Amino acid sequence: TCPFYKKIPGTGFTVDAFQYGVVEGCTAYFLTHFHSDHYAGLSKHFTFPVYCSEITGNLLKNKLHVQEQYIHPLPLDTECIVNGVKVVLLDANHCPGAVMILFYLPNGTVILHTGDFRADPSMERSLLADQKVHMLYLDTTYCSPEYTFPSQQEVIRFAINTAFEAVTLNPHALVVCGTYSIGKEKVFLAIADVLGSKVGMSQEKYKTLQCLNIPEINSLITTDMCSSLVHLLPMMQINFKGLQSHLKKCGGKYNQILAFRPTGWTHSNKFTRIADVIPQTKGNISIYGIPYSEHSSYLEMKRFVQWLKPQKIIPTVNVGTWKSRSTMEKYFREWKLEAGY
Ligand code: NI
């Protein structure tokens, strides 16, 4: 059944709750972003109101074929009324179109649901600065102190320098980047840019990217693989077998592959710096795992919560085991005592 942490008290609202059939008493279904564990269950047959960002609305229409009359996009950073309740959508710093949702309850309670987010100090100067938030439904993906990672900026610098050096040394090298969802577009766009190439991809992926309102996108991507030296492939194919196979397909236009796998966290983060990363190599193929995250580090999450000073925290990630629940609740109390709220 629909879990309590997907329900907004005092409303008929649910968040990211599309796989339970009809939720008894739900008058509006919000969708934070277009990732499959969140939209799971939506289709052309859905006949309730869906509230979301413009970009998420483009993806629902074009990729899932949800009918237009049930899609209600809202602009960001704007006070809106939905079934008699004031809401605001804020940028979540996750994937394109991803939002956090502020609900202003008739009784005076204010609730923030983060969806999936990467906490940033820039959020401290949004509409969140303007009033008190009583309850926080929090993206706790990496809520443990072992989870450190570099800035997105540091990671992109590393990838750009690496790719540029490789291709300038060998003009017959191919660069490949893995993907399995929206998000992390900076990785492959920044590399294609330093190399003066467009990124080549399947028709399905090109369609997905054309929904995202990225400026000048027609200048940066293409379905013509042969004219491109940065290819995108399914993440599943980013391994030595899948890459040798792929290399055959290019007809001796290339003799070397340099491939990037943008992972979340991986335990080499507890030892190694970004400057010190190395690839796995077999033959003329090298694969780099780069820790490009679109979720908060432990320290980023801690800072955001200690700034906001909520009265109650409701985790939305890692809630399935008692040991994870109990560990998270321990960090929350530490944070509150350290900061004095
Ligand atoms: Ni997500």
Q: How many residues does the chain have?
A: 341
Give 279 Cα–ligand 1 centroid separation in angstroms: 27
Give 116 Cα–ligand 1 centroid separation in angstroms: 5
Give 263 Cα–ligand 1 centroid separation in angstroms: 13
Structural method: X-ray
State the residue range of the domain holding 182: 148-295
Count of domains in the chain? 2
Report yes or no: 113 and 104 within 8 Å, Cβ to Cβ. Answer: no
CATH number at residue 154: 3.40.50.12650
Residues 3 and 142 in one domain: yes
Strands (E), 144-276: 173-179, 199-200, 221-222, 230-234, 256-263
Residues 27 and 77 in one domain: yes
Question: Whole-angstrom Cα distance, residue 244 to residue 164?
Answer: 22
Give 33 Cα–ligand 1 centroid separation in angstroms: 7
Residues 333 and 256 in one domain: no
User: In units of Å, what resolution does this entry have?
Assistant: 1.8
CATH number at residue 141: 3.60.15.10
Give 152 Cα–ligand 1 centroid separation in angstroms: 16
| Structure tokens that stand for 154 in this block | 């540091």
Residues 140 and 85 in one domain: yes
Residues 7 and 132 in one domain: yes
3-class secondary structure, 71: strand
Report yes or no: 303 and 281 within 8 Å, Cβ to Cβ. Answer: no
Give 295 Cα–ligand 1 centroid separation in angstroms: 8
Give 197 Cα–ligand 1 centroid separation in angstroms: 29
Residues 166 and 289 in one domain: yes
| Structure tokens that stand for 244 in this block | 């040798």
Give 94 Cα–ligand 1 centroid separation in angstroms: 7
Give 36 Cα–ligand 1 centroid separation in angstroms: 8
Question: Whole-angstrom Cα distance, residue 41 to residue 56?
Answer: 15
Residues 179 and 258 in one domain: yes
Residues 85 and 211 in one domain: no
